[PDB]
Amino acid sequence: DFDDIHRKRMEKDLNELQALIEAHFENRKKEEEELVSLKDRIERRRAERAEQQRIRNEREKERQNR
Amino acid sequence: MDAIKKKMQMLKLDKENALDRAEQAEADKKAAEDRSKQLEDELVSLQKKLKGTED
Amino acid sequence: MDAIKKKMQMLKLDKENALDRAEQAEADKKAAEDRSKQLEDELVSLQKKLKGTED
């Protein structure tokens, strides 16, 4: 007894810390930069949609104005 | 978050174990040194008794 | 961040302090124990010479 405390504690004392650091690094890398880039891309597409909407609205208002 | 708390808990388990071992060792030193000094006093009294016997 | 660094460093410092204190205490314990053994060994011979003197 009291000799399995080492073999159940020291293991996770380093392996768990290193593995969780690895998980945090990979998750941040996968998540943050890709999300910001994708949001910028969607913003550019949204601006293009806004331009198309403005053009169509203006041309239809020009024709229909009677 | 998640892993950070567990790592802190590990760092705290090390804290408790190290501190407890230090305190126990300090108590051991106190007891052992008291033993040694009492033995030395007994030796001194034996020297004095030997001196009286020599007289 | 900020809190993680300071807390982790302080806790590791606590562990190291306790460990070194324990090592110093155990070293002094071993030295006192050996000196006590010397005191016992000399005291036995002191008793023997006292007994011869008394005879």
Swiss-Prot record, chain A:
Where, by tissue, is this protein expressed?
A: Heart. The fetal heart shows a greater expression in the atrium than in the ventricle, while the adult heart shows a greater expression in the ventricle than in the atrium. Isoform 6 predominates in normal adult heart. Isoforms 1, 7 and 8 are expressed in fetal heart. Isoform 7 is also expressed in failing adult heart.
Its GO CC terms are: cardiac myofibril; cardiac Troponin complex; cytosol; sarcomere; striated muscle thin filament; troponin complex
Which ranges form a coiled coil?
A: none
Residue stretches spanning the membrane? none
Give the top-rank taxon of the lineage listed in the UniProt record for this protein: Eukaryota
Q: Name one GO molecular function term.
A: identical protein binding
Annotated GO biological processes are: cardiac muscle contraction; muscle filament sliding; negative regulation of ATP-dependent activity; positive regulation of ATP-dependent activity; regulation of heart contraction; regulation of muscle contraction; response to calcium ion; ventricular cardiac muscle tissue morphogenesis
Q: Where is the composition biased (Basic and acidic residues)?
A: 25-66
| UniProt KW keywords | Acetylation, Cardiomyopathy, Disease variant, Muscle protein, Phosphoprotein
Q: So what does this one do?
A: Troponin T is the tropomyosin-binding subunit of troponin, the thin filament regulatory complex which confers calcium-sensitivity to striated muscle actomyosin ATPase activity.
Involvement in disorder = Cardiomyopathy, familial hypertrophic, 2: A hereditary heart disorder characterized by ventricular hypertrophy, which is usually asymmetric and often involves the interventricular septum. The symptoms include dyspnea, syncope, collapse, palpitations, and chest pain. They can be readily provoked by exercise. The disorder has inter- and intrafamilial variability ranging from benign to malignant forms with high risk of cardiac failure and sudden cardiac death. Cardiomyopathy, dilated, 1D: A disorder characterized by ventricular dilation and impaired systolic function, resulting in congestive heart failure and arrhythmia. Patients are at risk of premature death.
Family, per entry: Belongs to the troponin T family.
Q: What is this protein called?
A: Troponin T, cardiac muscle
> Native species of this protein?
Homo sapiens
Q: Give the gene symbol.
A: TNNT2
Curated annotation (Swiss-Prot), chains B, C:
Its induction, per UniProt? Answer: Induced in stimulated quiescent cells.
Under the subunit heading, UniProt states: Homodimer. Heterodimer of an alpha (TPM1, TPM3 or TPM4) and a beta (TPM2) chain. Interacts with HRG (via the HRR domain); the interaction contributes to the antiangiogenic properties of the histidine/proline-rich region (HRR) of HRG. Interacts (via N-terminus) with LMOD2 (via N-terminus) and TMOD1 (via N-terminus).
Q: Please give the function described in this protein's UniProt entry.
A: Binds to actin filaments in muscle and non-muscle cells. Plays a central role, in association with the troponin complex, in the calcium dependent regulation of vertebrate striated muscle contraction. Smooth muscle contraction is regulated by interaction with caldesmon. In non-muscle cells is implicated in stabilizing cytoskeleton actin filaments.
- List-wise, which residues carry N-acetylmethionine? M1
Subcellular localization is given as: Cytoplasm, Cytoskeleton
What does the entry's free-text domain comment contain? The molecule is in a coiled coil structure that is formed by 2 polypeptide chains. The sequence exhibits a prominent seven-residues periodicity.
The UniProt entry's sequence similarity note says: Belongs to the tropomyosin family.
* Phosphoserine modification, residue list: S45
UniProt lists compositionally biased (Basic and acidic residues) regions at: 12-38
Misc note: The sequences of cardiac and skeletal muscles are identical.
Domain of life, source organism: Eukaryota
Section covered of the full-length record: 1 to 55 of 284
Chain positions covered by the region annotation Disordered:
1-38
User: What organism is listed for this UniProt entry?
Assistant: Mus musculus (Mouse)
Protein name (record): Tropomyosin alpha-1 chain
